[PDB]
Amino acid sequence: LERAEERAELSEGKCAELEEELKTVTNNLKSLEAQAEKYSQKEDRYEEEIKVLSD
Amino acid sequence: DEDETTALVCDNGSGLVKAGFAGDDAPRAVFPSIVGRPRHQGVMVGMGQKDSYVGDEAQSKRGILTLKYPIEHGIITNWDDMEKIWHHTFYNELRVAPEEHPTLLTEAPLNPKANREKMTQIMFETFNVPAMYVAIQAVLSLYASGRTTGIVLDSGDGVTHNVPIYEGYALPHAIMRLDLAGRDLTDYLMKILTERGYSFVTTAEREIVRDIKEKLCYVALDFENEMATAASSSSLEKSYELPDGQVITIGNERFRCPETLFQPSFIGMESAGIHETTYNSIMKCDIDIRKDLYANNVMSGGTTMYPGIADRMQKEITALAPSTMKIKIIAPPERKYSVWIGGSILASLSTFQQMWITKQEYDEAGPSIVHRKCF
Amino acid sequence: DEDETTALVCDNGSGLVKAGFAGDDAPRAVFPSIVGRPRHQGVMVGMGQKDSYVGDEAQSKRGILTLKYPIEHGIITNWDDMEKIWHHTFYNELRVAPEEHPTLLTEAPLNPKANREKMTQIMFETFNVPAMYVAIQAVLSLYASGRTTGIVLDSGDGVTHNVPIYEGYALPHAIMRLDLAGRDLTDYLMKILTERGYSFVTTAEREIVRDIKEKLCYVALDFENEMATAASSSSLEKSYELPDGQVITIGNERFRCPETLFQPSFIGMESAGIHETTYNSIMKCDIDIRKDLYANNVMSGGTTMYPGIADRMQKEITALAPSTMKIKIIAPPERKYSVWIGGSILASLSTFQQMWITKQEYDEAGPSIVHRKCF
Amino acid sequence: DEDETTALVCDNGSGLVKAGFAGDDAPRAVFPSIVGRPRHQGVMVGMGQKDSYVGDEAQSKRGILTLKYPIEHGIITNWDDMEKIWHHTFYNELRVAPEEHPTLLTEAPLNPKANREKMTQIMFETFNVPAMYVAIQAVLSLYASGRTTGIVLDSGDGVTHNVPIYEGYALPHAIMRLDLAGRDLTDYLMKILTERGYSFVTTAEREIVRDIKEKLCYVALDFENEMATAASSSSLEKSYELPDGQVITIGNERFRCPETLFQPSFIGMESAGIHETTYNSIMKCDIDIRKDLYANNVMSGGTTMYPGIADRMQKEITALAPSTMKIKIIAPPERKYSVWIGGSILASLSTFQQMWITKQEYDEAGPSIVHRKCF
Ligand SMILES: Nc1ncnc2c1ncn2[C@@H]1O[C@H](COP(=O)(O)OP(=O)(O)O)[C@@H](O)[C@H]1O
Ligand SMILES: Nc1ncnc2c1ncn2[C@@H]1O[C@H](COP(=O)(O)OP(=O)(O)O)[C@@H](O)[C@H]1O
Ligand SMILES: Nc1ncnc2c1ncn2[C@@H]1O[C@H](COP(=O)(O)OP(=O)(O)O)[C@@H](O)[C@H]1O
């Protein structure tokens, strides 16, 4: 039980660590979703600067 | 127990000494820089009991010990305790005999020469090492990270050195030595946990608070948003189990402590903050250097592991930086371990084999040799 | 019966409560912070007899009461009992109803926030006080002592705060709070008196040991020289008459008990003493501050009522301090009462009229307001 | 308190400010170019305490203030702090309302024009001065020294200008401007005092190191010989006392700080040093000019107070110079103050009374007028 509880604690430790990493990565995912979109928009703002400059 | 005369590597901080042998990618063990002493009178006969305990012994028997660290913001001031820490490290756990191996130690480039001279002296005079080198922590994180350029920000337990490196060169006029680290963050947390009804003063209590910070705290990408939320709702509290079965919950203190890195005024320090010192190290470099340092904000040591810090530091520099410039943080998993790792890499480089001080050179040159051979 | 609608002042410590009116000389009455309750079965009927006794009532009928203290280590933990102490204090000795009078209460800045919130809440919700303020005991000590600059060493019943103040500003990171106070000195004396053949375990016995300490003990400017004679000759003993006619004497224990303040390990505390905390508070302040704090160590509170303490402290800090520098101590006759004195001074200052929390502000904000407006 | 409407003269540098009245021999008051602000939370009530402190007030109350210098390498960027410095200088110490007196301010000709435009503006738009004249420090240096012809060597706290003047005319193509000055020399000293075990980082500490430099540092005629000697013997060590009783003993750092003027790489500067630039200013002038400039190398401003500087500069220029030619340095006792004196001389010359901008020509033309009327 102590070892199983220890495993629960170690696994919970990992669970929490992964959760923290999950959230960090997910938060990065979200900032990156925002960046991938802002960047796709920049891909267009810059493409537009090229089109405008081309004109 | 090694089958080659590989250099030994030991990263001696105010927190823990990371140690192992050159060529690995990790220390064999981390040896807290602690020497403990009993603070009570023995009653029972035949109990063994020593005058002092070292490293993990000091923490394991801490219930009746007073625990002290020999290192003050990167400089060893208590050499008796470091000989015990080093002896234990080699003798019991690394299973190392320094007499047969070169040894590489690490240090902030900004610390008093007394420390680099004395570390050179003890490995040659107490441990009989055949060779020595003391390395720069900015350099060591950059090697571990695969970089030659960047601002290295330690924000460690002891000191923050804030050192810009370009193409492998130091840019010393742009260095911001800062007297702010995890040891101060911990004291701040003890005072704000006192506000919550949990008074932490004695050694067992100090070690608990350092454990609370390490498991519960974060910086926050945006302090004020987390501040206002954590101060308004229990949904931001996180619990911690105290060793006696009691528990503590922590609210906005969870980030108010780490925040001192960005706001040193929290502990009475007069400082720009880690994001401004990082910024100023970029800003003070030449105009054709600035772009490369903006793109290479390099992490070193611990606290760089706090949630929101890699994103926050990049935002805080961006907010101060000129437009056009692209600002990026290099925050590898080799975090909290990159200085030791850099030592392994450096000790092992073919280009570094002539950088080692040999025993014969040391004996002829005297202790001041570290100034001519290391840095 | 009063000639002004002035503020009320009450230094509610873990020991005693000093109470009176702001603008007066001293407290009108000093009460033990005690609520007493009978521990025996009644046999006679129509004997009056209270469920609980307060302050001086608790001590006057103590022969069959167990006596409890609602305040410990600077914090009220039993708000119901403090409301009872206050109802008695205000209506029976000060002859005032707080409903028409602003009231000032005191704490240490490092006590849990609950202390300031319950002090404020009791007076606003059970007494309907028109206004409240929670004061800093160190500030009150400085006003009473004639200082704006110095280290306040309050050495109280439940806690020693140790705070540097410069030009009216706090240097809060330099507060060296110590878990050693007069209540612990009493318990230490009980144990050493037991070694001498006089065991004390119950409340009546505990109140007497505190009384023995207060009348017989001293600290000594030099405890080693004092011990050389006190441990060698009966001429250094002093007798105390116990309530039951027995006589107890104390020899070198007479100064070894107070010596705990310079040796906290005597009660199991991990500390070097008050002079170490005084010194470190100075050390954590800037170099252009330190000169004024060395010249202004301020003793306040009780337990400073030990002969030899002003000289003991000057020697003990001088011993840690740099040479050339002058180390000086302020230790006025307004000892133990100086916090009350400061309370009256602060409550009545024209510059303090806007520092008060009014009932309207309290009702709109709730009790957490004390944390934001007082300090 | 002045009996005549003479010009006010104020030399406002990045270090100190020299203020007095034209026609006199010396400034009446000297202030640091500092505005101080408290960096701590007030604890006591009715303590007064200013929001900001100026000049000597800023240093006198500095124990809890952060001290800022409004001038960055010779240019004023903080005009809120400079109007405080000027108001204090005029109103409290010179006891004058500028409305009744013309004012002379000073700056190098390569100082961005924005600064002389703003100096003209502060006196006309905030202080309502009836007239203005911004002077060239080199012009003032030669008047004070009794010369019309010579090299002005003026390394200050901010920058070094290096300007040749012949028969009163400037040879501007020969000006060698360097970002090399006392503020950087001080920064180098802080780093090397850290190497010795004395780490100085806070405002109080930064002011101490600057004070150490002024009292202990020198250059020596021969650097290699002074270096070799300091490295060989304690006879070149000098002590300094710090405000709290600490004592620092300084060795070769005593001249390595000043050495940066000849070795700018010590502070990350791309320069060959002040002697190369003093020499080049002579060299860039026509050969029928050079003979008079070589024989009249004139020191002004501070840093010229380092013993061995007049002789090292004369020797280095001589070594770089053609043979036969006589090289001589003028280094009068009116050093560090001679620019103020030159200000007094210029402001009061009858030949200069038509050079003053009135508050009419200024208002009609605007701020840019300084570029046409002064320099
Ligand atoms: N996950 C984390 N959360 C909060 N702080 C951390 C974390 N990891 C490391 N730090 C802090 O950094 C320090 C340990 O990092 P480290 O650089 O390895 O010490 P050292 O210099 O002795 O090697 C401690 O003060 C620790 O509290
Ligand atoms: N002569 C004395 N000897 C020892 N202790 C004393 C003496 N006089 C007063 N004290 C101590 O003063 C304490 C209460 O005073 P006080 O300082 O006003 O508490 P506080 O400041 O925290 O409100 C008690 O513990 C009492 O024993
Ligand atoms: N004894 C000295 N040692 C080193 N430098 C000096 C000495 N005396 C004067 N100087 C420098 O010159 C400054 C004062 O002269 P000055 O040049 O007129 O002010 P500024 O350069 O700011 O215009 C001082 O701040 C100091 O740094």
Side-chain angles (χ1 to χ4, degrees):
Chain A
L1 188 160
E2 288 171 350
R3 286 190 293 273
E5 198 63 21
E6 184 180 62
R7 286 191 293 274
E9 291 170 353
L10 291 168
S11 294
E12 184 62 21
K14 288 190 293 184
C15 185
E17 291 167 356
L18 291 167
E19 183 176 356
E20 290 168 353
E21 291 174 358
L22 176 63
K23 289 177 181 177
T24 298
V25 173
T26 302
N27 288 338
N28 287 338
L29 184 156
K30 289 186 291 190
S31 72
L32 265 293
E33 184 69 55
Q35 290 169 29
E37 180 62 13
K38 287 173 184 177
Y39 291 10
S40 72
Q41 292 169 357
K42 288 171 76 176
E43 203 203 345
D44 290 344
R45 291 180 182 94
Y46 280 58
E47 172 153 22
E48 179 63 9
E49 183 63 9
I50 295 303
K51 200 269 185 185
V52 172
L53 291 170
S54 180
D55 287 346
Chain B
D1 289 338
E2 297 295 328
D3 56 348
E4 181 58 291
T5 58
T6 183
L8 302 171
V9 180
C10 301
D11 184 21
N12 300 303
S14 65
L16 301 98
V17 180
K18 297 190 278 274
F21 64 92
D24 205 335
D25 294 321
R28 286 176 59 81
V30 299
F31 299 86
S33 297
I34 301 171
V35 177
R37 278 152 185 106
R39 70 185 187 86
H40 299 91
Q41 173 67 55
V43 71
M44 297 185 74
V45 176
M47 296 292 103
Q49 304 302 311
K50 301 297 186 184
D51 55 289
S52 61
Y53 295 86
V54 60
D56 53 296
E57 292 177 338
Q59 290 180 317
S60 292
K61 300 298 187 185
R62 68 187 179 272
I64 57 168
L65 305 177
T66 176
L67 301 182
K68 297 183 181 181
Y69 296 82
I71 296 167
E72 299 178 19
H73 305 289
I75 181 162
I76 298 164
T77 62
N78 185 323
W79 287 92
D80 293 347
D81 288 351
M82 287 302 297
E83 286 186 338
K84 288 180 175 178
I85 292 165
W86 281 322
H87 297 165
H88 174 66
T89 296
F90 297 122
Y91 295 93
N92 291 322
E93 296 294 321
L94 299 180
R95 302 186 69 84
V96 171
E99 187 175 2
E100 297 181 3
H101 302 276
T103 299
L104 186 148
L105 303 177
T106 69
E107 204 189 336
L110 311 179
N111 290 343
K113 70 181 181 177
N115 193 57
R116 72 191 77 173
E117 289 180 349
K118 288 188 174 74
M119 288 190 291
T120 301
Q121 291 172 343
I122 186 167
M123 288 305 300
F124 284 120
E125 298 173 354
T126 298
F127 296 95
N128 300 316
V129 73
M132 289 293 288
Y133 189 84
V134 181
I136 296 169
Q137 70 191 38
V139 169
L140 295 169
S141 185
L142 288 168
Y143 278 115
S145 295
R147 297 290 182 272
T148 62
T149 299
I151 307 300
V152 182
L153 185 270
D154 195 68
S155 297
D157 193 77
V159 62
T160 300
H161 65 298
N162 295 301
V163 177
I165 306 296
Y166 181 83
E167 294 284 336
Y169 291 82
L171 303 173
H173 64 284
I175 296 173
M176 302 291 285
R177 219 224 165 245
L178 171 65
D179 294 338
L180 175 62
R183 183 71 44 93
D184 297 294
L185 298 180
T186 301
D187 190 72
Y188 181 82
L189 183 58
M190 290 190 282
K191 289 183 176 67
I192 65 174
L193 295 179
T194 300
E195 290 176 351
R196 294 184 70 76
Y198 295 78
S199 171
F200 296 94
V201 177
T202 65
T203 293
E205 292 171 341
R206 291 194 298 274
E207 292 297 305
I208 291 167
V209 174
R210 53 153 328 165
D211 189 54
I212 290 168
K213 183 178 75 71
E214 291 169 4
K215 293 185 173 76
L216 278 72
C217 290
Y218 67 99
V219 298
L221 192 154
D222 293 305
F223 175 78
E224 293 81 2
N225 289 342
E226 291 296 311
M227 178 191 72
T229 302
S232 298
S233 177
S234 66
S235 67
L236 269 282
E237 291 188 352
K238 182 79 169 184
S239 65
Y240 178 89
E241 180 181 348
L242 301 170
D244 61 354
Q246 295 187 92
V247 300
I248 185 168
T249 65
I250 300 173
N252 64 8
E253 302 85 359
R254 190 174 173 198
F255 46 97
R256 286 160 62 194
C257 164
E259 183 65 12
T260 299
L261 291 173
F262 292 89
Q263 298 189 63
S265 68
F266 282 19
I267 60 168
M269 178 64 193
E270 184 188 359
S271 172
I274 62 168
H275 63 292
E276 178 175 339
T277 58
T278 298
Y279 178 77
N280 288 343
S281 292
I282 296 167
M283 179 276 291
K284 290 182 175 183
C285 295
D286 287 350
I287 194 164
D288 287 315
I289 295 173
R290 284 175 179 178
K291 74 185 198 296
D292 295 289
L293 296 174
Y294 277 119
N296 293 276
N297 183 352
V298 177
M299 300 296 102
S300 175
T303 76
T304 60
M305 299 299 290
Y306 283 122
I309 200 166
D311 296 299
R312 169 143 189 207
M313 285 292 288
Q314 187 172 291
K315 182 176 179 179
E316 289 289 1
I317 278 50
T318 298
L320 298 174
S323 68
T324 301
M325 297 294 100
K326 185 172 289 190
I327 299 91
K328 183 172 174 69
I329 292 173
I330 310 303
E334 283 80 14
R335 291 193 297 274
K336 132 196 227 180
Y337 293 92
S338 67
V339 173
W340 183 90
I341 293 166
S344 180
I345 297 300
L346 177 58
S348 299
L349 295 175
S350 67
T351 58
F352 182 74
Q353 296 305 305
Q354 299 300 311
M355 291 300 295
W356 285 99
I357 298 167
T358 67
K359 180 71 166 71
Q360 187 64 39
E361 289 172 325
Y362 176 83
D363 287 345
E364 293 178 7
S368 67
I369 190 166
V370 69
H371 192 74
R372 297 192 299 278
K373 296 290 189 176
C374 295
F375 65 92
Chain C
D1 297 344
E2 302 296 317
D3 57 335
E4 181 59 293
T5 58
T6 187
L8 308 179
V9 178
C10 302
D11 190 23
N12 290 274
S14 68
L16 296 100
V17 180
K18 297 181 284 279
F21 292 79
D24 207 335
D25 170 15
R28 298 279 178 90
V30 180
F31 304 86
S33 295
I34 299 174
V35 180
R37 293 182 172 89
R39 69 186 183 89
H40 287 267
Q41 173 66 55
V43 295
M44 300 187 78
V45 62
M47 297 293 103
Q49 304 303 309
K50 297 180 180 178
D51 57 315
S52 63
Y53 296 79
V54 294
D56 54 304
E57 292 174 343
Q59 290 183 321
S60 292
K61 300 298 188 186
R62 69 187 180 273
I64 57 169
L65 307 178
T66 183
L67 302 182
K68 304 295 184 183
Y69 291 79
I71 299 168
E72 66 183 17
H73 305 292
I75 181 163
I76 298 170
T77 62
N78 185 337
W79 74 267
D80 190 64
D81 283 348
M82 288 308 300
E83 187 274 334
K84 290 181 178 65
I85 295 298
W86 292 345
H87 188 80
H88 172 68
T89 296
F90 290 124
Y91 289 85
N92 292 331
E93 297 297 321
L94 274 60
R95 307 293 175 83
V96 63
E99 183 177 1
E100 296 182 358
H101 296 263
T103 299
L104 185 148
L105 303 175
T106 65
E107 68 173 12
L110 294 174
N111 288 137
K113 68 182 180 179
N115 188 54
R116 59 172 68 197
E117 290 180 354
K118 296 304 291 184
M119 286 190 294
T120 300
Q121 182 173 48
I122 293 167
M123 292 306 300
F124 282 120
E125 297 183 29
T126 66
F127 293 90
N128 298 312
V129 71
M132 292 294 291
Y133 187 83
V134 177
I136 299 169
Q137 290 172 311
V139 169
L140 299 183
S141 294
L142 289 171
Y143 284 116
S145 294
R147 295 291 184 275
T148 62
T149 300
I151 307 299
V152 180
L153 307 169
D154 58 314
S155 200
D157 182 84
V159 62
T160 301
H161 186 62
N162 298 308
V163 56
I165 299 172
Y166 185 84
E167 290 283 342
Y169 290 81
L171 277 287
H173 60 285
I175 298 168
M176 299 292 156
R177 185 176 64 81
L178 174 65
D179 288 339
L180 174 63
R183 187 181 293 186
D184 298 305
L185 297 178
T186 299
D187 199 78
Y188 182 79
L189 180 61
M190 291 174 71
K191 290 184 179 65
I192 205 165
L193 293 176
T194 299
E195 289 183 352
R196 291 179 66 78
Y198 297 82
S199 174
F200 297 87
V201 296
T202 67
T203 294
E205 291 170 352
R206 286 174 178 274
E207 289 294 301
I208 295 301
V209 173
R210 179 171 64 81
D211 196 66
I212 293 168
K213 182 186 80 191
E214 290 176 5
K215 292 184 175 73
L216 274 67
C217 292
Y218 66 98
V219 72
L221 70 90
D222 184 329
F223 77 94
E224 184 174 359
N225 288 339
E226 190 67 15
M227 195 174 297
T229 299
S232 297
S233 177
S234 66
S235 67
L236 273 284
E237 292 192 350
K238 178 74 176 178
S239 296
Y240 179 92
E241 295 180 358
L242 296 169
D244 61 355
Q246 293 185 85
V247 177
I248 185 166
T249 67
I250 304 173
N252 65 5
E253 305 87 356
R254 192 174 168 201
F255 71 82
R256 289 164 63 199
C257 293
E259 182 177 322
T260 301
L261 295 176
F262 297 88
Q263 295 288 279
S265 67
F266 288 180
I267 60 166
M269 177 64 201
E270 188 185 350
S271 175
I274 293 170
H275 60 290
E276 180 67 27
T277 59
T278 300
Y279 179 75
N280 288 335
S281 291
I282 295 168
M283 181 186 74
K284 294 294 188 180
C285 298
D286 287 347
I287 194 165
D288 286 317
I289 295 173
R290 289 180 180 184
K291 73 185 200 295
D292 296 294
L293 296 175
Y294 278 116
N296 295 279
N297 291 316
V298 179
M299 305 303 295
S300 73
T303 78
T304 61
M305 299 297 287
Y306 288 132
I309 195 66
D311 293 293
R312 178 64 178 279
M313 286 293 285
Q314 186 173 43
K315 182 180 178 186
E316 290 288 8
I317 283 76
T318 299
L320 300 175
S323 68
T324 301
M325 180 58 68
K326 305 296 184 182
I327 296 89
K328 300 179 184 180
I329 296 173
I330 295 95
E334 297 185 359
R335 24 209 212 177
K336 111 205 253 180
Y337 297 94
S338 63
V339 173
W340 184 88
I341 291 168
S344 180
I345 293 166
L346 179 60
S348 66
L349 297 176
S350 67
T351 57
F352 185 72
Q353 293 298 306
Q354 299 300 308
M355 291 297 291
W356 286 99
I357 298 167
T358 66
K359 185 171 189 292
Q360 185 64 38
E361 288 170 314
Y362 176 87
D363 286 344
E364 292 175 2
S368 67
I369 192 168
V370 70
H371 199 73
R372 294 191 299 277
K373 190 174 190 183
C374 290
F375 63 91
Chain D
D1 294 342
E2 188 71 12
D3 292 332
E4 181 59 293
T5 55
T6 187
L8 304 179
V9 179
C10 299
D11 187 22
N12 293 273
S14 67
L16 304 177
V17 179
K18 298 183 286 279
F21 291 84
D24 206 332
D25 296 300
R28 304 270 179 86
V30 179
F31 307 89
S33 294
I34 299 172
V35 177
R37 293 180 174 85
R39 69 183 184 87
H40 296 86
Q41 172 66 55
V43 76
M44 299 187 76
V45 177
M47 297 293 104
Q49 305 301 315
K50 297 179 181 178
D51 54 294
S52 63
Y53 296 80
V54 59
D56 53 303
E57 292 175 343
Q59 290 179 317
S60 294
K61 275 73 168 172
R62 70 187 181 274
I64 57 168
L65 308 178
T66 183
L67 301 183
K68 304 294 185 182
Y69 289 84
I71 298 167
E72 298 179 16
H73 299 289
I75 183 163
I76 299 164
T77 62
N78 185 331
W79 285 84
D80 298 289
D81 291 349
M82 288 302 296
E83 73 174 14
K84 289 181 184 299
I85 291 166
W86 272 313
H87 187 279
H88 175 65
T89 296
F90 297 134
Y91 295 93
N92 289 328
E93 296 300 321
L94 297 182
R95 307 288 173 81
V96 60
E99 186 176 2
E100 296 178 359
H101 294 63
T103 300
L104 186 149
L105 300 175
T106 65
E107 295 302 320
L110 295 175
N111 191 298
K113 70 184 181 181
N115 195 63
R116 68 193 79 157
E117 289 176 351
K118 289 184 177 73
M119 287 190 290
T120 302
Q121 291 169 356
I122 186 167
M123 292 308 301
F124 284 120
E125 297 180 51
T126 297
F127 296 104
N128 298 310
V129 72
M132 288 293 290
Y133 191 67
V134 179
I136 296 169
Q137 290 174 314
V139 167
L140 300 184
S141 294
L142 291 172
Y143 282 117
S145 294
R147 295 291 185 276
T148 63
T149 301
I151 303 299
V152 178
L153 185 280
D154 55 6
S155 297
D157 297 295
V159 298
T160 299
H161 181 65
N162 298 308
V163 55
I165 298 172
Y166 184 86
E167 293 283 321
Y169 305 70
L171 290 318
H173 63 284
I175 297 168
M176 299 295 108
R177 186 186 185 281
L178 299 173
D179 291 330
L180 175 61
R183 184 169 293 168
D184 301 306
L185 299 181
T186 301
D187 188 72
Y188 187 71
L189 184 59
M190 289 189 282
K191 289 182 175 67
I192 65 177
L193 294 178
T194 299
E195 288 176 347
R196 291 174 65 88
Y198 293 77
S199 173
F200 295 89
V201 298
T202 67
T203 293
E205 291 173 338
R206 291 193 298 272
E207 287 289 295
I208 291 168
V209 174
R210 187 176 65 77
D211 194 63
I212 291 168
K213 180 196 74 168
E214 185 172 2
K215 291 184 175 73
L216 276 72
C217 290
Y218 66 97
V219 295
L221 191 156
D222 287 339
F223 287 7
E224 294 80 3
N225 288 331
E226 194 69 18
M227 179 277 292
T229 300
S232 299
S233 178
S234 66
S235 68
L236 296 179
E237 290 185 331
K238 182 80 168 185
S239 65
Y240 176 91
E241 296 181 355
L242 284 80
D244 59 351
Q246 291 180 65
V247 178
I248 186 167
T249 300
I250 300 171
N252 64 15
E253 300 84 2
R254 190 174 171 205
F255 58 86
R256 287 164 62 197
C257 165
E259 181 171 20
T260 298
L261 292 173
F262 296 84
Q263 299 292 342
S265 68
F266 288 5
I267 59 168
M269 177 65 197
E270 187 185 354
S271 176
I274 63 169
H275 58 293
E276 187 69 18
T277 55
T278 297
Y279 174 78
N280 287 345
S281 291
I282 295 167
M283 182 186 75
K284 296 295 186 181
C285 298
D286 290 349
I287 67 288
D288 286 325
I289 296 172
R290 290 180 184 179
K291 74 185 199 297
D292 296 292
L293 295 175
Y294 276 117
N296 297 278
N297 183 346
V298 179
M299 292 183 166
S300 70
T303 79
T304 56
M305 299 301 290
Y306 289 126
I309 196 67
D311 295 298
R312 182 167 177 82
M313 289 296 285
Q314 187 174 291
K315 182 173 178 177
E316 289 294 305
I317 279 44
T318 298
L320 295 169
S323 66
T324 301
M325 180 60 70
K326 296 179 182 178
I327 298 90
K328 297 185 181 183
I329 295 175
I330 306 302
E334 291 83 12
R335 292 173 296 180
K336 122 194 239 185
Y337 297 96
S338 65
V339 173
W340 182 88
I341 292 167
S344 179
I345 292 167
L346 179 60
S348 66
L349 295 176
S350 65
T351 61
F352 182 73
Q353 298 304 305
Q354 301 302 311
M355 293 300 293
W356 286 100
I357 299 167
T358 63
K359 190 175 192 294
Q360 184 66 48
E361 289 177 347
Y362 177 81
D363 287 345
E364 292 174 2
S368 68
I369 192 168
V370 69
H371 203 73
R372 295 190 300 278
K373 293 287 188 173
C374 297
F375 64 93

